[PDB]
Design an enzyme around this catalytic site. Structure first.
Site, short mmCIF file in Angstrom:
data_model
loop_
_atom_site.label_atom_id
_atom_site.label_comp_id
_atom_site.label_asym_id
_atom_site.label_seq_id
_atom_site.Cartn_x
_atom_site.Cartn_y
_atom_site.Cartn_z
N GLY A 7 2.03 -9.81 -1.76
CA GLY A 7 3.56 -10.09 -1.37
C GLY A 7 3.63 -10.90 -0.18
CD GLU B 219 0.49 -11.40 4.53
OE1 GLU B 219 0.06 -10.55 4.18
OE2 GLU B 219 -0.38 -12.20 5.33
CB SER C 98 -0.95 -0.19 1.21
OG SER C 98 -1.77 1.17 1.12
N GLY C 99 0.59 2.16 -0.80
CA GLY C 99 1.34 3.26 -1.15
C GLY C 99 2.42 3.35 -2.07
CB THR D 286 -3.39 1.07 -8.29
OG1 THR D 286 -3.73 -0.01 -7.39
CG2 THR D 286 -4.58 1.39 -9.24
CB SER E 255 -6.05 -5.11 1.42
OG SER E 255 -5.23 -6.06 1.17
CB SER E 256 -6.47 -6.73 -3.97
OG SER E 256 -6.97 -5.75 -4.68
CG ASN F 273 -4.43 -1.43 1.57
OD1 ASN F 273 -4.97 -0.26 1.46
ND2 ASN F 273 -3.96 -2.11 0.45
#
Lengths: 154, 786
Positions: free
Chosen positions: B456, B458, B174-175, B179, B233-234, B230
């Site tokens: 990814g 974690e 995230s960030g 995207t 989050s997907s 996030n």
């Protein structure tokens, strides 16, 4: 001292007449220029190693004290020459055609080794450097021949 | 508008490059040391006392640090280098430094071997313009500065040249800008693959990017959720296949999804939500939906999605649902289909509220109310009394006949959870299928370039079943990378005529993969534990240790805990580090008993969408009916798809947690480079001869080390041989290839020392002659005036 050919002594005496005083000799701040007047090209490090100074009137060098310095510099052998400088500037000659970017040479002279100042490079280029291309290239062989007083390479 | 010049955001200028390369530098004293705050600090060795090094830092501090923590620095030639595989020093602080220095110079792209690293600038740099894109059309990667466009164009050319499908694996937390980077890759392919037909339908249907983005509200409403780290989050892997025709023009697209986090349908951690859709529908922003769905205004009436957080400050669920409902219309869902999607989504919420109880010591369970079941029945279009009967007393296939079976409270409760997850999972699959119908152009499909987006690796303070699953996945993905790098390196060495003996770099990850997936492995033991009703979390934990500790190298004791909470049960040596796993609840989480009798009822109900989404079910790898076995199946399906493509790898980086431009949090970036494989790539390439120079470049650079020796030699390969032999380099520190020379790590740093010393000396001579010229000039002035 006494192991210098007589003709060479007379050249030294002529430099001391122009640069120094009859009694004191030359000022140690002019040791580098005095050696250069005799067609030598010592580095700043070599000058300093032989007694050169950076402020005037701190030290004086008599003729008989200058001769063994002159002799040691003249006998010192790895001090550079035109041929060494050709090989050095080939490092900037991508096309192997005897040219390099003027900006590359100016930066090298101002940033590497015992760097010069802007004014010295300006005078050096004005006297010895040919005009640059639109691409910014110059031929460095004529520049070095003039700087080193090697007319045979022109 | 006019496109800004991208040069300042892609190139290091000639002026800046000569400043960098002439900077003072001491190979013997410069070093990197670790630092708690900045990750690493640049230092100068002031003294060494045995194994203790005294390192001066910026500001005057002197820190004593053990020599093993003092690491080497790259010389100035490698400053802001475009491909870090060309650095002579290949270690973590040197990678961070090169990335940081490029980032500080507004250069967000950097190569690391195959990897293209993209560090989010949190600024609008003109790097996505048509002006920029044209720089990269048909250009080899080393002909142009680093750019995701160079990777994209390379996959395009390789597709047309090799006639093989390509894949682009893009990572990023995230960030990190994943995207945005994905959208621009799609747009880039839409550019190089544009045609008269695509430009025709681009005003009615829109661009390929727009068509794909138009599916986001639906797929993210059902597939995204707020996690701890996030807000959006997907929870699924996405493979966007961009198809091309026989002439290299666009031919449509389709989306494939993998490994939807089904558990989140019925379970949430305290700081997380379930999928957005549940709270979107409950917002009431679309008239009539909640009435159709028989939903209240109280989210806590629905336990399966109300166990953690139910609102998120950064999300207006009312506005999102309005956009989701509009997207259903835009995407061609009929009114009936859309409302059936809502009905089924709400029926999952209602099913979770169906309660059961036990009367006396009778093992059989019975209803504890029927209001919730009635709503499920209305929405699914089935009979209520039959639903409970099939849940309480299903029938099992015993050979020919059907025999009734009894169920206790826990067994029926677990079947509800499995049905809630199963229905939702099948609904999501159908939604993807419907979204793909909008991307279909019916054109001839020849090859595709597929963009992969999947979570990814974690590492958290607590690592549970979900961590093992996604880390298992990324181990396979990283092995996929290692093998590809291995194949290319093998081809490079053969092409250059140098001996190659290295084993497949993917083998390095095999022991960890096998520990997880092979028989008697972790997942296998978990599945087999369900054959023992006496099994508990401790029985499972004990069998893992008894089977693998001291016997499977990647299996290790867990790290000692912070107080009693952090206590884990075992650790795995992953490529991304040692990870300690807590196995609490794994036995329960892994159960997935789907009631075939109920599914048969669903298949004959009046809700037509329910029938469709169960079409491939005919109700009437390891352990049957477990979450782990289904996870392995889809992961293998994903890997098989990828192994049939030629891959490319983009790594998006979040430089700091505040979105501040120009700031690099060293520890945050280091953690990403470990999880996304960049440092694994560094580890592999430095094992052999990572640095390579074309012979003309080498001769040009190091000719000054022996000008006499190469005098008159035209061949730059022979010159290189002469020059190297004239140095003190060991015979085994390099390899002479057909067109380039190979070097072990650190060797070019030694060549740079030789060059610096000789260049500095000759320049001092040249400057001494310059001073002599100017001096003799001034001496003639004095000689005349005197």
């Amino acid at each position: 001292m006494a192991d210098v050919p007589k003709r060479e002594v007379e050249n030294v005496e002529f430099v001391f007449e122009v640069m120094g005083s009859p009694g004191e000799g030359i000022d140690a701040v002019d040791l580098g220029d005095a050696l250069r007047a005799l067609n030598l090209n010592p580095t700043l490090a070599l000058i300093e190693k032989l007694g050169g100074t950076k402020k005037r009137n701190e030290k004086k060098i008599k003729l008989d004290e200058f001769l063994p310095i002159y002799s040691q510099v003249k006998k010192e052998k790895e001090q550079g020459c035109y041929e060494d400088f050709i090989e050095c500037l080939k490092l900037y000659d991508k096309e192997e055609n005897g040219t390099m970017l003027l900006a590359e040479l100016q930066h090298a002279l101002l940033a590497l080794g015992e760097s010069l100042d802007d004014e010295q490079v300006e005078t050096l280029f004005a006297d010895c450097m040919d005009p640059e291309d639109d691409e910014g290239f110059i031929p460095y062989s004529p520049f070095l021949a003039r700087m080193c007083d090697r007319p045979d390479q022109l | 508008q006019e496109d800004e010049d991208p040069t300042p955001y892609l190139f290091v200028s000639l002026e800046q490059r000569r400043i960098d390369q002439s900077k003072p530098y001491d190979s013997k004293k410069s070093c990197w040391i670790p630092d708690e705050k900045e990750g690493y600090l640049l230092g100068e060795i002031k003294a060494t006392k045995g194994d203790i090094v005294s390192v001066g830092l910026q500001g005057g501090e002197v820190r004593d640090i053990k020599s093993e923590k003092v690491e080497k620095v790259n010389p100035p030639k490698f400053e802001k280098i475009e491909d870090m595989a060309d650095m002579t020093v290949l270690n973590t602080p040197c990678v961070l430094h090169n990335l940081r220095q490029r980032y500080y110079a507004k250069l967000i792209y950097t190569y690391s071997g195959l990897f293209c690293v993209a560090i989010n600038p949190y600024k609008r740099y003109p790097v996505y313009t048509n002006r920029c894109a044209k720089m990269y059309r048909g250009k080899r990667r080393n002909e142009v500065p680093p750019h995701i466009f160079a990777i994209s164009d390379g996959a395009y050319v390789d597709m047309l040249t090799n006639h093989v499908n390509q894949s682009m694996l893009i990572t990023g937390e995230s960030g990190a800008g994943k995207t945005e980077n994905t959208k621009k890759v799609i747009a880039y392919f839409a550019t190089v693959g544009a045609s008269k037909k695509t430009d025709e339908a681009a005003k009615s249907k829109g661009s390929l990017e727009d068509q794909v983005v138009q599916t986001n509200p639906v797929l993210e409403a059902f597939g995204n959720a707020k996690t701890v780290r996030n807000d959006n989050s997907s929870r699924f892997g996405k493979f966007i296949r961009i198809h091309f025709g026989p002439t290299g023009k666009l031919a449509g697209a389709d989306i494939e999804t993998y490994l939807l986090e089904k558990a989140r349908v019925i379970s949430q951690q305290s700081l997380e939500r379930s999928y957005h859709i549940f709270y979107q529908i409950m917002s009431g922003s679309v008239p009539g939906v909640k009435d159709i769905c028989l939903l209240t205004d109280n989210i806590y009436d629905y336990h399966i999605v109300s166990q953690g957080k139910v609102t998120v400050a950064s999300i207006d669920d009312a506005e999102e649902f309005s956009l989701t409902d509009q997207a259903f219309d835009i995407l061609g869902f009929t009114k009936q289909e859309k409302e059936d999607v809502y009905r089924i989504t709400a029926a999952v919420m209602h099913m979770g509220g169906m309660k059961f109880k036990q009367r006396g010591r009778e093992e059989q369970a019975e209803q504890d109310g029927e209001e919730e079941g009635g709503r499920v029945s209305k929405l699914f279009g089935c009979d209520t009394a039959e639903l409970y009967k099939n849940l309480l007393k299903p029938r099992i296939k015993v050979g020919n006949e059907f025999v009734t079976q009894g169920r206790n409270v826990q067994q029926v409760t677990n079947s509800i959870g499995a049905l809630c997850k199963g229905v939702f999972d099948r609904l999501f699959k159908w939604l993807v299928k419907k979204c793909n119908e909008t991307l279909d152009t019916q054109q001839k499909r020849q090859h595709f370039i597929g963009v992969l987006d999947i979570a990814g690796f974690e590492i958290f303070e607590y690592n549970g079943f979900e961590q093992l699953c996604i880390n298992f996945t990324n181990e396979k993905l990283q092995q996929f990378f290692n093998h590809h790098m291995f194949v290319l390196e093998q081809e490079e060495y053969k092409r250059e005529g140098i001996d190659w003996a290295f084993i497949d770099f993917g083998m390095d990850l095999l022991a960890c993969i096998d520990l997880i997936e092979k028989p008697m492995g972790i997942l296998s033991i978990l599945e087999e534990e369900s054959m023992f009703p006496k099994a508990t979390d401790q029985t499972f934990s004990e069998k893992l240790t008894n089977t693998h500790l001291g016997k499977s190298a990647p299996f290790q004791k867990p790290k000692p805990p912070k107080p009693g909470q952090q206590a884990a049960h075992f650790a795995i040596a992953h490529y991304a580090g040692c990870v300690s796993y807590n196995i609490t609840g794994w036995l329960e989480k892994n159960k997935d008993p789907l009631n075939d009798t109920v599914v048969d009822q669903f298949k004959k109900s009046q809700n037509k969408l329910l029938i469709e989404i169960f079409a491939d079910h005919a109700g009437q790898g390891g352990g049957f009916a477990t979450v782990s076995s289904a996870y392995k199946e889809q992961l293998n399906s994903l890997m098989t798809t990828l192994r049939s493509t030629q891959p490319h790898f983009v790594r998006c980086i979040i430089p700091n947690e505040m979105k501040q431009p120009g700031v690099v949090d060293a520890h945050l970036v280091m953690h990403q480079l470990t999880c996304n494989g960049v440092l694994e790539g560094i580890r592999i390439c430095r094992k052999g001869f990572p640095n390579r120079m074309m012979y003309p470049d080498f001769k040009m650079r190091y000719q000054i080390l022996n000008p006499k020796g190469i005098k008159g030699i035209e061949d730059p390969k022979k010159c290189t041989k002469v020059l190297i032999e004239s140095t003190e380099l060991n015979d085994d520190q390099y390899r002479l290839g057909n067109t380039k020379v190979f070097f072990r790590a650190g060797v070019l740093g030694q060549m740079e020392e030789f060059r610096d010393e000789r260049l500095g000396k000759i320049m001092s001579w040249m400057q001494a002659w310059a001073r002599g010229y100017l001096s003799r000039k001034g001496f003639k002035k004095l000689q005349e005036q005197r």
